[PDB]
UniProtKB/Swiss-Prot annotation, chain A:
Lineage: Eukaryota, Metazoa, Chordata, Craniata, Vertebrata
Modified positions (Phosphoserine) in chain numbering: S240
Gene that this sequence comes from: PSMA3
Protein name: Proteasome subunit alpha type-3
Protein family (similarity comment): Belongs to the peptidase T1A family.
Positions carrying N6-acetyllysine: K54, K203, K227
PANTHER family given in the database record: PROTEASOME SUBUNIT ALPHA/BETA (PTHR11599)
Domain of life: Eukaryota
Cell compartments where the protein resides: Cytoplasm; Nucleus
Cellular component aspect of the GO annotation: cytoplasm; cytosol; extracellular exosome; nucleoplasm; nucleus; proteasome complex; proteasome core complex; proteasome core complex, alpha-subunit complex
UniProtKB/Swiss-Prot annotation, chain B:
GO BP annotations, alphabetical order: immune system process; negative regulation of inflammatory response to antigenic stimulus; proteasome-mediated ubiquitin-dependent protein catabolic process
Positions bearing carbohydrate: S109
Protein name per Swiss-Prot or TrEMBL: Proteasome subunit alpha type-1
SMART domains the record matches: Proteasome_A_N
TM ranges: none
Assembly mode: The 26S proteasome consists of a 20S proteasome core and two 19S regulatory subunits. The 20S proteasome core is a barrel-shaped complex made of 28 subunits that are arranged in four stacked rings. The two outer rings are each formed by seven alpha subunits, and the two inner rings are formed by seven beta subunits. The proteolytic activity is exerted by three beta-subunits PSMB5, PSMB6 and PSMB7. Interacts with NOTCH3. Interacts with ZFAND1.
One Gene Ontology cellular component: proteasome core complex
Species annotation: Homo sapiens
Cross-link (Glycyl lysine isopeptide (Lys-Gly) (interchain with G-Cter in ubiquitin)) at residue(s): K114, K207
InterPro entries noted in UniProt: Ntn_hydrolases_N (IPR029055), Proteasome_alpha (IPR050115), Proteasome_alpha-type (IPR023332), Proteasome_alpha1 (IPR035144), Proteasome_asu_N (IPR000426), Proteasome_sua/b (IPR001353)
Induction profile: Induced in breast cancer tissue (at protein level). Up-regulated in liver tumor tissues.
Location in the cell: Cytoplasm; Nucleus
Swiss-Prot record, chain D:
Function comment: Non-catalytic component of the 20S core proteasome complex involved in the proteolytic degradation of most intracellular proteins. This complex plays numerous essential roles within the cell by associating with different regulatory particles. Associated with two 19S regulatory particles, forms the 26S proteasome and thus participates in the ATP-dependent degradation of ubiquitinated proteins.
Cellular location(s): Cytoplasm; Nucleus
PTM annotation (Phosphotyrosine): residues: Y57
Family affiliation: Belongs to the peptidase T1B family.
Protein name: Proteasome subunit beta type-4
Transmembrane segments: none
Record carries keyword Phosphoprotein: yes
Single Gene Ontology BP annotation: negative regulation of inflammatory response to antigenic stimulus
Residue span relative to the full protein: 46 to 261 of 264
Entry's induction text: Up-regulated in fibrolamellar carcinomas.
Subunit text: The 26S proteasome consists of a 20S proteasome core and two 19S regulatory subunits. The 20S proteasome core is a barrel-shaped complex made of 28 subunits that are arranged in four stacked rings. The two outer rings are each formed by seven alpha subunits, and the two inner rings are formed by seven beta subunits. The proteolytic activity is exerted by three beta-subunits PSMB5, PSMB6 and PSMB7. Forms a ternary complex with SMAD1 and OAZ1 before PSMB4 is incorporated into the 20S proteasome. Interacts with PRPF19. (Microbial infection) Interacts with HTLV-1 Tax protein.
Domain of life: Eukaryota
UniProtKB/Swiss-Prot annotation, chain G:
Location relative to the cell: Cytoplasm; Nucleus
Task of the protein: Component of the 20S core proteasome complex involved in the proteolytic degradation of most intracellular proteins. This complex plays numerous essential roles within the cell by associating with different regulatory particles. Associated with two 19S regulatory particles, forms the 26S proteasome and thus participates in the ATP-dependent degradation of ubiquitinated proteins.
Catalytic activity of the protein: Cleavage of peptide bonds with very broad specificity
GO MF terms held by the record: endopeptidase activity; threonine-type endopeptidase activity
Full-sequence range covered: 44 to 263 of 277
UniProt name for this protein: Proteasome subunit beta type-7
Subunit structure: The 26S proteasome consists of a 20S proteasome core and two 19S regulatory subunits. The 20S proteasome core is a barrel-shaped complex made of 28 subunits that are arranged in four stacked rings. The two outer rings are each formed by seven alpha subunits, and the two inner rings are formed by seven beta subunits. The proteolytic activity is exerted by three beta-subunits PSMB5, PSMB6 and PSMB7.
Family: Belongs to the peptidase T1B family.
Active site: T1 (nucleophile)
Keyword vocabulary terms for this entry: Cytoplasm, Host-virus interaction, Hydrolase, Nucleus, Protease, Proteasome, Threonine protease, Zymogen
Keyword Signal attached: no
Enzyme class, first EC level, given as a word: hydrolase
EC number: 3.4.25.1
Keyword Cytoplasm: yes
Amino acid sequence: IGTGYDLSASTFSPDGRVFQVEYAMKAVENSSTAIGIRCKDGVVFGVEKLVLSKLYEEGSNKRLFNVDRHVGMAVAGLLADARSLADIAREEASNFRSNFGYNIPLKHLADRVAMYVHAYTLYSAVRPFGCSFMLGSYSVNDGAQLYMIDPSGVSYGYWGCAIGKARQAAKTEIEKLQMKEMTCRDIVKEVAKIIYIVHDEVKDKAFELELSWVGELTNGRHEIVPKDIREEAEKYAKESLK
Amino acid sequence: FRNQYDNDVTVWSPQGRIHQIEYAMEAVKQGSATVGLKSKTHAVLVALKRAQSELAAHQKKILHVDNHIGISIAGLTADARLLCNFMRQECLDSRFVFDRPLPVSRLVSLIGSKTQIPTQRYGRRPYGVGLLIAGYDDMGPHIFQTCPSANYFDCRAMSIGARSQSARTYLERHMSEFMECNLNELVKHGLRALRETLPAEQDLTTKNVSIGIVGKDLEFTIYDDDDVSPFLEGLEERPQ
Amino acid sequence: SIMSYNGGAVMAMKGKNCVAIAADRRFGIQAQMVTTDFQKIFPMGDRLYIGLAGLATDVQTVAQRLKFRLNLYELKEGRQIKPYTLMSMVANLLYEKRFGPYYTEPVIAGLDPKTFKPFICSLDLIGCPMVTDDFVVSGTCAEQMYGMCESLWEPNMDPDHLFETISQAMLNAVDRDAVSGMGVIVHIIEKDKITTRTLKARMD
Amino acid sequence: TQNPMVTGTSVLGVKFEGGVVIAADMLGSYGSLARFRNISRIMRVNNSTMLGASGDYADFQYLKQVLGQMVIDEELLGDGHSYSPRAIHSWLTRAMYSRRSKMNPLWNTMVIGGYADGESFLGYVDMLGVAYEAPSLATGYGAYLAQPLLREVLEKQPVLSQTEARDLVERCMRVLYYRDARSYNRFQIATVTEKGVEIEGPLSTETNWDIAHMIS
Amino acid sequence: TTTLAFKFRHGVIVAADSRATAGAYIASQTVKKVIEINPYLLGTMAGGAADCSFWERLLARQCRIYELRNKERISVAAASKLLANMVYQYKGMGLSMGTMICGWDKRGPGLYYVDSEGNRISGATFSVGSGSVYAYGVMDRGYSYDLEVEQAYDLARRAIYQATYRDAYSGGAVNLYHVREDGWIRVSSDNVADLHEKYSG
Amino acid sequence: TTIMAVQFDGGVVLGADSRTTTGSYIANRVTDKLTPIHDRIFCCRSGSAADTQAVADAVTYQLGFHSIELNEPPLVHTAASLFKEMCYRYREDLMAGIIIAGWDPQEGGQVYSVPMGGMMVRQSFAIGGSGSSYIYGYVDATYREGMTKEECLQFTANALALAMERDGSSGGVIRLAAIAESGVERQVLLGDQIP
Amino acid sequence: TTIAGVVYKDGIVLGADTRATEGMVVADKNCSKIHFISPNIYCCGAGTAADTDMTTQLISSNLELHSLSTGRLPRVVTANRMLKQMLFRYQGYIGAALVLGGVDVTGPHLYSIYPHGSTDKLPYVTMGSGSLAAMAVFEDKFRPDMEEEEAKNLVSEAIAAGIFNDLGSGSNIDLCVISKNKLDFLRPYTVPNKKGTRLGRYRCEKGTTAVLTEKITPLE
Amino acid sequence: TRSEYDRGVNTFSPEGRLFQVEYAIEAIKLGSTAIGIQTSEGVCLAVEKRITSPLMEPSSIEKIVEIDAHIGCAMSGLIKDAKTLIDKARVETQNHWFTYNETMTVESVTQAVSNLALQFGEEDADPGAMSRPFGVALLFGGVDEKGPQLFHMDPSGTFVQCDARAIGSASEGAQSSLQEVYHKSMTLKEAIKSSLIILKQVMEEKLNATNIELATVQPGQNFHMFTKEELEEVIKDI
Amino acid sequence: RFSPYVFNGGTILAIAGEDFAIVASDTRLSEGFSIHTRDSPKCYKLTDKTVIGCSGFHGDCLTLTKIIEARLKMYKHSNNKAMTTGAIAAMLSTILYSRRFFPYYVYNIIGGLDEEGKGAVYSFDPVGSYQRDSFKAGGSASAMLQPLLDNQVGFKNMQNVEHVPLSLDRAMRLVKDVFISAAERDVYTGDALRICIVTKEGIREETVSLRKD
């Protein structure tokens, strides 16, 4: 159980593991589920948002942010953590633009944000950012990339990944989908049905689906799904979820 | 003690929780209830004033920060007051540099950024104050509830504090009129909400209630015993 | 004209197994005369003496900080300071304030502690180290003493001859300038005795 | 910036019925020398507001970078609000006043215009913070030359047609080229309207050398 | 400006014109020179008008703090020294000050003159400003340590009018104060023209 | 000096004189104003030499950092941005005009100029230095579009030759560089080769 | 002041003067201007003498630390990079004209930093007040890829022209020779002008000077 | 297990309480009883001396002090803590009389003092400030543009306008008595008589001249602390 | 090498009546010999019984006005009370001396209502000195407005005249005539005029054009 070793993030285990980042893993797996898929000419994002109370307005706690004009922001974990990480990432992108004069590559932004989130992982006076976030972009001269960065600090490249209480579940049902060929039009449908099947209705009901994407379909610009395409995706979901 | 995981905000539970943050969240459950409603063009903040003794004044729970934006506090006096001076300074800085009012969403975003630092970094205690934010901007009225977990929500309404679940379920019963109500209607709805929070032996007197209303053309104005008098004259009687 | 603000005249000499250092005694402002007990020559040891030329108060400050740091070094090491270390030390003391320079041009002289080989050195305002095998002067009378010590000095000069040569050189050099003069102190130091004198020149 | 090296031509600004028109040349001039003749001094900041400038192009690119970062942040939070032309005017005033007050001034006479909520804005902050909202604006020697002309065309009729405004700014650039040596035969027109901001150009100048034939 | 303040057996008076000029054009003729900083301590005026007002208001704050902390009234000497030090650290970058610290405390009626240059000097007869010499001449011709209250008032008005009359950078109104063990008092304010009529014959 | 760089379809050719003087005395007649900043991005330097070399090493470090982090060679736009910010941040103390020429796979051959004061701009021909006030009319009269590597070479040779014979701040030799997908070709003109 | 530098077929030869002047009066006739930095690199300074001295010891100490940490012989590019960085740090406030030349694993090298802080690699370069005469010789008689002894007399006659065409240089010549297997620190290489013989003894014997007071303090 | 949360002010109880602040609150009861009452004619402040020795100089022990001629104070808690609080309050009142050249209202006085308070857990203490909550409860009374006004300050930084508040060891009992003894139309003389009555009922010893310090602030005069003769006059009636 | 202060002119007149304060300015914004815009009022409302008017370096003018509005905002937030005219005057003195050695190059004139419904005009030297007056003109034509207002409003240098008080219409005609004279006399002013009156009921404004030349 590691008692006496997991009171700080600068203390290793007898097996050689920092238990703070593992507890952050646990917190992320105890959070909401978000999927993303990169299409042929862009990337799309999907958030399963639980309406804890109908008193909450729609669009509250918006979770699919956009770090840059061409870079989105999907994230699972703590909303305060999500906003702080988004803010530091936005400042990083703005500094990159101010110093280097062009758009930040997704891989380079992921590397910088992973270094920064690591800088909060290994200190003792601070705590690792217990939230896992997504990076997505589309550049006409670079391509499309997707990255998942967890509080552990590892920024690996995933074609399309999920984070939350249905990590393995979403892996099982996103593996059956063929991915690399179709574009956002034929990928939003799959994302919608995947999100609507991973959610549990008997327990943790009352969820809504919000979506966002980046790509040439909006001129390499990240934005939420248009209301018409949004209701069309919901209609395909209700038809396909039967 | 298995709860050695709640002595500072910078340690996680084995189950992946920050128990200090949860205690800060429960802290604002101690303060008095406060419920807010918003119309097509008007947002109301109504709170239940409390007094240390009947021989002394009631503790103010509605705070004015700027002509268009207003806040209501429920929790620690110190943290809420500090947040209020921070709000006033930022609103003034926005008026000075941009000559435009601070957006409600932007204000609440900077509030979240400010209050996340105590949650993340060792040192300052987490801001254990539940804030109800009601203002006006381009797309109309907004009600923002900033939970002491450094989180905020865009809500049609919210009651935060002691026995606020009664007001929560009252508003859950009464969504269907909030959007289309005028000033008096929304005010009476909020008053019925607090009356639901308040037990049987007590009633919403003049000294007991504090009402703050903002709108498109009407600034965030807070009413008192004499000022709440016309608004409570239209108030009905308690369905007891 | 900063040198003319107070002025001064110092000279250092060495002979056969002995050293002779001489300095002016005048103290006065750029125009008016005040005293005659100014100390331009200072003992950095039993056989080590340093001559200073520059602003009067700058001279005293650099002398005092030098004495402080030199006693620090002597306590740290426990050994007598060998004069080349002294010359590098004074060069550092002047140079460490390159952007705030002390407009002071000092001079040192002494002997090697082991083989008793005399050594003299010259320093610049901003602290350029320089060593001569013959002689060195500093102050307002640089031209005259330079020329007549070039025309007067001989190598391998005996101790009594050393005292006579330094006395004649300093007196006939200070006869050629006014701001520095009116009394000169002469210190000849040998490994056996230290005869401290003051040659009788003109009081004018 | 204590020694101006690169300056800007006149920047003309007139708010017409339906939007705002800005014109300036490509004369990136190193002193009197026409160092550059293809630099666009006019460039939009958002869909509902835009800005052109005169003075050192270096601080102009500093400013467009800073303001572009601010507006991309504005559209990045996704809050619906955009910097109203009053907002850019205020930011420029306070920022450049503070920049000047520390004896590092922004040597740029600045023109800001926009069309929002059916109302036309036309502001101008100078090298030193004197800023205002007026129907017709001109910078450099434009304040000497075209500003009286725009005032004459507005004193009897402050409202001007889109073709009328276009021909007015064309004729003002014509007289600018006729009477100023810091102009190039090419200007960018920026028309910010309800449907948005659009940048066009350039056009040349024709000098009636009848002055030359009867001077002979 | 022109301020005269001389000490005698009965007390100390103070003189003040009211003319404020920016070069040639008279900015104002209704300027209160001597400042009512404290009910028992009086401050004068010279040099930069705003500099004087700011520094005297700072000193007023300081003496109020002192009397509230030590629960005893601040000495006039202490106040003068406090002014001197608080303006001294500002010496050299653009300060223009000349001021008299006048008041009666346990060590008798005190008077000290403070200035931007740096003198904090005590003494019986204090005259600074444009017409300082004109006031000094008449006062030293008429100074006796034994001036009785009514005759001290008469000679005070005489010397102050002589000062405000002989100067070209002075005019407007006149401010006159007297200090006693119960504090200072506003004695009179006679204009240049009315007092011209009185002193013409 | 006379640093004229002009881009062509496939890259950019950049030339310079070899004269550096401290007063009326020629200190060094073998000066190279073309400092390789990377494998396929170069620079042209005018003004105070020390500032140009210092900022050259600084940006060499910065785009080496960027190229090694992205595992991809930098774009000309990023480099030119680095020179722009470096010049502006020291514009009160920087007396240096830089031409950022080079080729990248993203777009091709690009010429970026940051003259005195720090205009980050791009154009066809970027002439700089005290010798750039003479051939401006000469290039405007001899400007044509699409000079091949040979035609670009002749443009450089004649233009810098007029600068050489007409201006006293341009002397020594003429150094050329050709940057393309094949790589970088650096050539030197001396003797009878210069017209 | 004269500093000169050439590269010969195998290494470097350096030539320096020995006259140091303050104002318009010479201070010393045999100052040492060839400065020790490394057992494989060497520098010559000009301008403010104290600045040259202190910057040379600073760079020599830093470079010795560098070499000891590496264990390898230091390279010329490293030394000149630190030298130019620190020279540009002060932005010409130091009047130090230095020329740097040495031999590394890449071969002989020779750089020249002006006091403002600019440098260039040259096969042959000189600086100083007498730089005109030295560089005139450098274009007149110098030959590249040229042997050791002919390098020696080339540099010697170049510095001789410097001393005989400038007031601020001479009375000694010192040379430093750098090679992959040779370091020849010739000091003095050849004195060009010895002080003339004194014809008249000024007769400074005993008793010629009177004294005020006596004071005797024995020691040791 | 409370013990893990009392150590330090930056800890949160499972019930969300600030145990360090609560301990500071209870530390007020260590101080002597102070009673202030608000009337239309003014405010009067009554306190207990708790003299340790007859050789004591009664002027030294300060339970009521003057922040400005228009305002009055009362203390209960640590002497040094309240000394810093009162010095800051006086500095602030002179700051206002400097910036706006006016007399600054008692609610703003308690605002600024509470700003100095509740700053224990603030990062601006890097130069040096309270790492621990201030340990004195403050009673502010005076006359401003809103007439006579009395404010009670809580070491946590909270303030409330109180018609009649009692702080100190007997705060509960004195407050309970003031609850029924207070009327809105009470005159200054009868209010002060009632206040000394409550002190007599509350204080551990008999009321003599050296057992009570008495203060009054009215719109007419400035802050007046009752002298020995005035204290005798007001106590002979009772 | 640089001038942080450019002259911009302007005229601020503030006559404080018996139960009102009448504060006036000209909306001409011109620099040296060039003219920026004829529409730029120099009157700035602070609160319902206090209105500031400042002239000088126009950037300094706008920054001063924003600073006073900001200080008003803190004063209202903290003291929960709108401050008096004298409070705003002391505020102006403090803020102006806070930049004493980098002086705020602006002539400030503040007019408002005292707590007894009495007129309040405070003449502010750009150095920081302030006085209580019933009338004051500042900026570019203060020297010429001073003596006429002295003889007519201050009853100076005139005898055999009843010391009559000021009225509403009387002072209204007064200020109107004095600006007609001021515009017709000084070439550095013109193109408009703005007149503001504040009394017990609140503030009022009126705009009259003037000679364009």
